Amino acid sequence: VPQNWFPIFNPERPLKIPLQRNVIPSVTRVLQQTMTKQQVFLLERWKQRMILELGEDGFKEYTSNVFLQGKRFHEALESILSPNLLKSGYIESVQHILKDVSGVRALESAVQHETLNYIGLLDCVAEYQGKLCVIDWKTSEKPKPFIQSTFDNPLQVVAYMGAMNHDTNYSFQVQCGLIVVAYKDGSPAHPHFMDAELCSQYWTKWLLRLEEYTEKKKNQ
DNA sequence: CTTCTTC
């Protein structure tokens, strides 16, 4: 009856291995276990300088509203891009960019690379002023006017791209990226667009961070 | 996994 057969026994021949060792890693964590010595340093100086102004608990809920404010923003964009939200400062801030968005092909949709073996969750694949791109919407309290102000956002964007131009669940491909940074006070958002060549150069930088991850784990 | 925090 069975049509494809593999052997139960191996013709070649206190373990307590955890389940997650074999899970396909995610795009974000691959990046978080590959941060530079200076990047981990700069963020920790920020956490400890924070907790001193707000106490161990005040910061703990400062973290809660940042995450939630992000949450509601993405719930807002899914309602507006599924085929009072206009009083949100973040939506006030993206309203101009958002009128440039049509042809939505995916919202909050998971992506998997079979050969490169990582997963991710794309914000949205839509047309922005005609160019079909992977879009990453992001909240921020400080302005991020240049793309190098967004830190690792370029590399996750290109990580979502090249992984979804091979994910079998997508018939189409994409060759551009867009990071949109929305601010709480309502001032206009900063679009950071990434044409095909600039996604190519970050894609190179992302393949380096993927090798660091596979290295650090194999010994560990 | 995300949602963010470095500059």
Author numbering: 96 to 108, 120 to 189, 199 to 335
Task: Please share text taken word for word from the publication where this structure appeared.
MGME1 (also known as DDK1) is a highly conserved, mitochondria-specific DNase. Human MGME1 (HsMGME1) protein is composed of 344 amino acids and belongs to the PD-(D/E)XK nuclease superfamily. However, in contrast to DNA2 (2–5) and many other mitochondrial DNases, MGME1 can cleave various types of DNA substrates with a preference for single-stranded DNAs (ssDNA). Structural analysis and comparison suggest that MGME1 follows a two-cation-assisted catalytic mechanism of substrate cleavage.
